[PDB]
């Protein structure tokens, strides 16, 4: 197998050609008819990556790769821009002014993806390790071979890929549309924005909250199985999206089966600048707390920074598998999301009780401070996506006698029967917590079969 560079590949030979390249863009493998699937992507290498810069405006140059197959599983799933792809037996031809490489995987063509970073997107999601630096993390057919003379090629292009993404945007301005101009588009377009929030809408669907450089916020539905790599704080490129003219409560982007959501490799200058420049927005949330019914989800809390790297556990696992799952049994501190259906005790004034640390008893303060130290003893009845359909509601406690969750309300415990100020803030918070589309993001500590909230405060 002889590998040729993109700009040197023969246009006349029409013979099978092979090459190594960097993927900067790609659609998701999509079905076209009762027997064919397609995957179109943009590729570049040391010889083809940028247009004649002087009037080009630092616009990236690239060749295209169109892989045809009879089965969905015979095509590559590009989750990240910057990774490398190796193609065998591809025929090149000029398509509307550009070098278009075509390969029929259903016949004799094959491909193989290599990770530019230490781990592939999937290996990062599962916290795994790559077999080696010459091992493909994905490939077509039952076998993939790598000869010794390739290592130098692979290792070199990997170094180039990082020099390229760190020096240039790769995904230039002409490759995406500003979100605040989305409504002006005739058809579909592309986006480059940061994920401000990943809201679990239901069992199989995530609702992404996006915001790009234009400062405009948009929401879009992202299937869990299709795009399992979405993560808050990360910048992604969305290939093919449409403006939803039928949504009036919030700005919504519509994706298609061929649409794709792609992240960037660590060295990406574009992704790095955007993760910093673009800052979280709560304007949508703030404005929603004024409406009787908000069609926009609002995350009222925020967990302590030290837990931001902690994965979340559904209520289904927390209450139905915590005593039978080997893994869940070894943990006492978990993170989870949910919405409050009801709060107890009903009377907000009883939320704070006097606590006697010697008898381990607490009592009402309707009879004054003679009950001991003031503490919060609130029992939330919650529910979430993983338990949305069952006939259950689960108890999540906020017992601060030991300091856990003492600042949840941003209101220090006090006799709510006498302190009107403290009582009013809590009653208000109570209306927000039980209001539709209000959710809680919090860490909980397991204690004697119960979950107590900790390291979690309001917004």
């Amino acid at each position: 197998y002889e590998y040729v560079e993109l700009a040197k590949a023969s246009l006349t030979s029409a013979q099978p050609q092979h090459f190594y390249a960097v993927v900067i863009d790609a659609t998701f493998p999509y079905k076209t008819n009762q027997e064919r699937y397609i995957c179109s992507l943009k590729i570049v290498d040391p010889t083809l990556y940028l247009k004649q810069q002087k009037g080009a405006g630092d616009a990236s140059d690239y060749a295209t790769l169109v892989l045809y197959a009879k089965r969905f599983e015979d095509l590559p799933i590009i989750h990240r821009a910057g990774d490398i792809i190796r193609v065998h037996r591809a025929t090149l031809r000029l398509y509307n002014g550009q070098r278009q490489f075509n390969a029929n995987v259903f016949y004799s063509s094959s491909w193989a993806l290599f990770s530019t970073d230490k781990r592939s997107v999937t290996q990062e999601i599962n916290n795994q390790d790559a077999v080696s630096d010459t091992t493909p993390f994905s490939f077509s057919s039952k076998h993939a071979t790598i000869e010794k003379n390739e290592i130098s090629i692979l290792q070199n292009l990997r170094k180039w890929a990082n020099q390229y993404f760190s020096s240039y945007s790769v995904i230039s301005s002409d490759m995406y549309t500003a979100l605040n101009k989305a409504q002006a588009q005739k058809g579909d377009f592309d986006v480059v924005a940061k994920i401000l929030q990943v809201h679990e809408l239901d069992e199989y669907t995530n609702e992404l909250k996006l915001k790009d450089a234009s400062g405009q916020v948009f929401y879009t539905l992202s299937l869990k199985l299709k795009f399992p790599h979405v993560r808050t704080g990360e910048v992604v490129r969305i290939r093919s999206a449409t403006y939803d003219e039928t949504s009036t409560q919030k700005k919504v982007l519509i994706l298609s089966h061929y649409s794709n959501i792609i992240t960037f490799i660590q060295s990406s200058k574009l992704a790095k600048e955007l993760r910093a420049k673009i800052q979280d927005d709560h304007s949508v949330e703030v404005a929603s707390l004024k409406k009787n019914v908000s069609l926009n989800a609002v995350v009222l809390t925020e967990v302590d920074k030290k837990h931001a790297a902690l994965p979340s556990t559904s209520l289904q696992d927390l209450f139905h598998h915590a005593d039978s799952d080997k893994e869940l049994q070894a943990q006492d501190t978990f993170r989870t999301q949910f919405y409050v259906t009801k709060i107890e005790p009903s009377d907000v004034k009883e939320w704070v009780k006097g606590y006697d640390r010697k008898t381990k008893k607490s009592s009402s303060l309707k009879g004054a401070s003679g009950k001991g130290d003031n503490i919060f003893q609130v029992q939330f009845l919650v529910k979430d996506a993983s338990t949305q359909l069952n006939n259950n509601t689960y108890r999540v406690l906020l017992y601060t006698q030991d300091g856990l969750g003492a600042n949840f309300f941003n209101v220090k415990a006090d006799n709510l029967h006498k302190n009107a100020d403290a009582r009013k803030k809590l009653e208000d918070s109570a209306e927000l917590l039980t209001k539709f589309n209000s959710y809680v993001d919090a860490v909980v500590e397991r204690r004697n079969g119960f979950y107590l909230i900790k390291d979690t405060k309001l917004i």
Binding site: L201, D202, T205, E207, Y219, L221, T242, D244, E245, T246, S247, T248, K250, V252, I254, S256, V293, L295, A297, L318, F319, H320, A322, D323, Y339, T341, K342, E344, P345, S346, E350, K360, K361, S362, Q377, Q379, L381, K383, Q388, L389, N390, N391, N392, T393, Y394, R395, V396, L397, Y399, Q401, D402, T434, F436, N437, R447, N448, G449, F450, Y451, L452
Partner: protein, 216 residues
Amino acid sequence: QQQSAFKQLYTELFNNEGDFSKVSSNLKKPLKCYVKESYPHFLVTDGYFFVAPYFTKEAVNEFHAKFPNVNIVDLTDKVIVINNWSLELRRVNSAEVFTSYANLEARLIVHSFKPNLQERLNPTRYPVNLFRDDEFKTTIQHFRHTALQAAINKTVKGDNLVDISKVADAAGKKGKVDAGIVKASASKGDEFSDFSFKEGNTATLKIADIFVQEKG
């Protein structure tokens, strides 16, 4: 604010406890819609979304009568006009019926529809499943959340708060997490079903029976 006739109708129905009589009257007018599919699933669109119309044994007999040279299962890419229809809520298995969400469905019961054969319709966006729409899905979640909040506030009482001693001073105390599980209603099974709207009831034909009635 709204442009999708199907989205507005279905939304109002849900925001009105399935009481179709309470939905706006200025919307109960004839519905001219494009036929996206006709088999194995009959799906029409309003230019933005596609829904599944349910024909009564009457509607199909009327159609065949006034239009003998026309087969319903072959109305793909053709446009129809439903002059007599209604909307009703039904409890379904969303895992089977893709034209629903959260085991709930808003059905378009067609009593009479005329096929405006060979009428070309304006070019629109690619039609999508209404029950897959973000806002509509949220509108349905609001519906359930409301039904659940009422049931829970009626079922849960007495402030049976976990005694503070069980959480404080629990070094030698072990417990099972299912102790935190609380029933949301007097529901019979393991699924929440304590709703207030009355499930619509109208005999409808399966798209397969009409296929046999036209080419058995």
